Design a protein around this ligand. Structure first.
Ligand SMILES: C[C@@]1(c2cc(NC(=O)c3ccc(Cl)cn3)ccc2F)C[C@@H]2C[C@@H]2C(N)=N1
Ligand code: NA
Ligand code: NA
Length: 372
């Protein structure tokens, strides 16, 4: 507990392509790089020679594979994947020294799913069975892990945003954060659902009814780049962000993520851009805490130094993607139905401002903030 030197730095990735961990499937073990995704619940791997893939799961080579004789078609708003379900033995080489029999969707056909030029070949959905496809009877990887081993029911993520970080499976590594962890309840075990109770731009409250902030849910999701905000909250937030930075002018298309903005190298004016704070429901009645991120988190480098504005409007509720998570060490404390936040020891900041996790604050009617 508290120290897992072998799992430190077990995450890799490239800007814009997410964070992946090395996994092995089958016997003899086939090594695959697998996207870490707290926003879905399927363990799904390329199983056929798609041209974007460095490698793929060759079921025929594994003696331990078992067919479930069942398919699954998974559409997303963007693209889709289809696959054949089965189980096989799975390990994480830079994780616990264990091997589990896990469900695997062997992806046979996909569209707008794999990233051309990425170094990952599947996805590890770390959320709950409730959102598993085709249904909640398909046991997610982490459930199998905890059922079959002595690994404690929790994991933590340090996303450092070329990119890298750590996934600590079964515990917490105190070297990965500074100060104290603050916990928010997991409202319901499907996505990692939480409740935002107040939002500030540069310490200035949006003063929206807090139900708007969670319309229709707020989740913590490592498989999404942006901080996504419900439309109505997004509108107020940009309005306030534009004002806080009106010292400079940018095309309206920029704020809508329709064009990049660029500066002469080493001259990105971080200081004109405001901090963004989310107050989250605390563990105690009428107690909250807040997390603060910098323009370093929401202004994403793209490759002048060109940046994309990564706060975007949503119709699926608030998504705390990599923009939020890169600022923090995040503990998915499944055993206690709570999520912990602490300032990440690796987060990008400057000499004037850092990410922050602060509490306690007194916040009333926090239960009214959840959409039903
Ligand atoms: C499974 C899903 C998903 C995530 C990804 N994620 C990424 O490509 C990605 C890119 C950059 C980052 Cl920082 C994280 N993830 C790709 C495909 C995909 F289907 C679908 C919906 C996007 C939601 C999610 N978390 N996972
Ligand atoms: Na166990
Ligand atoms: Na620490």
């Amino acid at each position: 507990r508290g120290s897992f030197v072998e799992m430190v730095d077990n995450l890799r990735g490239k800007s814009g392509q997410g964070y992946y961990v090395e996994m092995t499937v089958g016997s003899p073990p086939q090594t695959l790089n697998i996207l870490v995704d707290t926003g879905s619940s399927n363990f799904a791997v390329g199983a056929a020679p798609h041209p974007f893939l460095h490698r793929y799961y060759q079921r025929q080579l594994s003696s331990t594979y078992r067919d479930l004789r069942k398919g699954v078609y998974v559409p997303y708003t963007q693209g889709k994947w289809e696959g054949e379900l089965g189980t096989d033995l799975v390990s994480i080489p830079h994780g616990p020294n264990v091997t589990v029999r896990a469900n695997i969707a062997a992806i046979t056909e996909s569209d707008k799913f794999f990233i051309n030029g990425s170094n990952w070949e599947g996805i590890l959905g770390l959320a709950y069975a409730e959102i598993a496809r085709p249904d909640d009877s398909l046991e997610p990887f982490f459930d199998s892990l905890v059922k079959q081993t002595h690994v404690p029911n929790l994991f933590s993520l340090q996303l450092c945003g070329s990119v890298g970080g750590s996934m600590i499976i079964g515990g917490i590594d105190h070297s990965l954060y500074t100060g104290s962890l603050w916990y928010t309840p997991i409202r319901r075990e499907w996505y990692y659902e939480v409740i935002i109770v107040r939002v500030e731009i540069n310490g200035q409250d949006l003063k929206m009814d807090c139900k708007e902030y969670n319309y229709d849910k707020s989740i913590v999701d490592s498989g999404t780049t942006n901080l996504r905000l419900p439309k109505k909250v997004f509108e107020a937030a940009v309005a306030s962000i534009k004002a806080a930075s009106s010292t400079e002018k940018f095309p309206d298309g920029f704020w809508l993520g329709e064009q990049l903005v660029c500066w002469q190298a080493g001259t990105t004016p971080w200081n004109i851009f405001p901090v963004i704070s989310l107050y989250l429901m605390g563990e105690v009645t009428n107690q909250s805490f807040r997390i603060t991120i910098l323009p370093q988190q929401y202004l994403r480098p793209v490759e002048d130094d060109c940046y994309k504005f990564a706060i975007s409007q949503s119709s699926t509720g608030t998504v705390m993607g990599a923009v939020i998570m890169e600022g923090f060490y995040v503990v998915f404390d499944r055993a206690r139905k709570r999520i912990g936040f602490a300032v990440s020891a690796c987060h990008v900041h400057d000499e004037f401002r850092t990410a922050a996790v602060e509490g306690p604050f007194v916040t009333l009617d926090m239960e009214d903030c959840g959409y039903n």
